[PDB]
Amino acid sequence: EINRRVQASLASGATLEEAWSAIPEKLAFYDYIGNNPAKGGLFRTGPMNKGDGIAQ
């Protein structure tokens, strides 16, 4: 989906920086393996923030 949006942006005449800056942080954050539920541990307890941290 991200690539689709970026390509739509470029085709509309945006610059690379512009096209990628138009991508919502929320969307990008979904495209990150630290939010994949199949990356955990049985005794790795608590919130995801306790692992890779609080995303800023």
Partner 1 sequence: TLTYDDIVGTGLANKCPTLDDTARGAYPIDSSQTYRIARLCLQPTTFLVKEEPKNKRQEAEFVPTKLVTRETTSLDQIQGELKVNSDGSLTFVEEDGIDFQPVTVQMAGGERIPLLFTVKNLVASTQPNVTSITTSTDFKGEFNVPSYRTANFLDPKGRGLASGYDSAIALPQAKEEELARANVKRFSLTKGQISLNVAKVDGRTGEIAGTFESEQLSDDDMGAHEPHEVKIQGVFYASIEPA
Ligand X SMILES: CCCCCCCCCCCCCCCCCC(=O)OC[C@H](CO[C@@H]1O[C@H](CO)[C@H](O)[C@H](O)[C@H]1O)OC(=O)CCCCCCCCCCCCCCCCC
Contact positions vs ligand CLA (CB under 6 A) = 42-43, 45-47
Could you say which of 2, 50, 52, 55 contacts ligand X (CB under 6 A)?
50
The answer to whether 19 touches 32, Cβ cutoff 8 Å, is no
| Token pair listed for 9 | 């942006």
CB-based contacts of 11, cutoff 8 Å, min separation 6: none
Could you say which of 17, 36, 53, 54 contacts partner 1 (CB under 8 A)?
53
Q: Strand, coil or helix: what is 47?
A: coil
Closest residue to ligand CLA in the complex (CB): 45
Residues of this chain that bind partner 1 (CB under 8 A): 34, 51-53
